[PDB]
């Protein structure tokens, strides 16, 4: 189906504890494939998936230099935002960036991204047109004016339409065994009495890839969104993901509840019930 590539940058200041650390991680869909950490004893862009290991020395050397230079740019940006927000040099602050591209089944560009946050709040984002910016506040409007004057969006657009989509297509081919394989969820329902009056029904999904899934409970065919406890989808550590959804049911009414599972790996959505 459709696929994504994303790079996640985090830079965090630590006044009195040296210079801000910079981390860059890269993903294709829900698979991490590269990392760089400026706090490592010998910072280097390193492989994190088997299918990227085949890239030659020039790939590793070029990406390492890019991340070493980006480390410095983010340190400059942290100093800049202390000025733009009238903040002291005493506190710790964070800049984040997410950038990348989505492609369809034919490998054509669906959309690009280049967006930033300061202290966990939106700062500036490239709009979907890849030609204009959304600034969150008057500080980000200063960056917007600077970036409009320098025609930054044109340069970001060229990377997102060219390099990003070309390398994502290459990675998808090189990693086709895993990146292009959906693992459906293994599902079951558990039952636990809470008291003489109620019991919990928990619908499990395990071992699935990619992470996107829909897990819902119905009571007499009606969605129980407000009454369902739904945990965040979580990594198992073997590439796959897990999720559960639970409902508290009146004793003796268990068969009125059905669990519904939708996932890319399933040709047809599943319906499950507690099977005593």
């Amino acid at each position: 189906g459709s696929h994504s590539m994303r790079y996640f940058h985090t830079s965090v200041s630590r006044p009195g504890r040296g210079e801000p650390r910079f981390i860059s991680v890269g993903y294709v869909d829900d698979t991490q494939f590269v990392r760089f950490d400026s706090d490592a004893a010998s910072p280097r862009t390193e492989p994190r998936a088997p299918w990227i290991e085949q890239e030659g020395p020039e790939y590793w050397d070029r990406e390492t230099q890019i991340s070493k230079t980006n480390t410095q740019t983010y340190r400059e940006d942290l100093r800049t935002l202390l000025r733009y927000y009238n903040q002291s040099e005493a506190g710790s602050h964070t800049i984040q960036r997410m950038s990348g591209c989505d492609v369809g089944p034919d490998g054509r560009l669906l959309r690009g991204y280049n967006q930033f946050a300061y202290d966990g709040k939106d700062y500036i984002a490239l709009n979907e047109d890849l030609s204009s910016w959304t600034a969150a506040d008057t500080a980000a409007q200063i960056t917007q004016r600077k970036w409009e004057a320098a025609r930054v969006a044109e340069q970001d657009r060229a990377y997102l339409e060219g390099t990003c989509v070309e390398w994502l297509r290459r990675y998808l081919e090189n990693g086709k065994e895993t990146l292009q394989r959906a693992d459906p969820p293994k599902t079951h329902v558990t039952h636990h009495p809470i008291s003489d009056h109620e019991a919990t029904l928990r619908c499990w999904a395990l071992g699935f890839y990619p992470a996107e899934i829909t897990l819902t409970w119905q009571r007499d065919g009606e969605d129980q969104t407000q009454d369902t406890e739904l945990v965040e989808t979580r990594p198992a550590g073997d590439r796959t993901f897990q999720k559960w959804a639970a409902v508290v049911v009146p004793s003796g009414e268990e068969q009125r509840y059905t669990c519904h599972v939708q996932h890319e790996g399933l040709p047809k959505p599943l319906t499950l019930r507690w099977e005593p």
Binding site: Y7, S24, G26, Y59, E63, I66, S67, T69, N70, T73, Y74, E76, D77, T80, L81, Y84, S99, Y123, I124, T143, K146, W147, A150, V152, Q155, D156, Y159, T163, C164, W167
Partner: peptide, 9 residues
């Protein structure tokens, strides 16, 4: 593949 940041804030 990721490129250099285009420009500082």
């Amino acid at each position: 593949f990721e490129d250099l940041r285009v420009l500082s804030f």
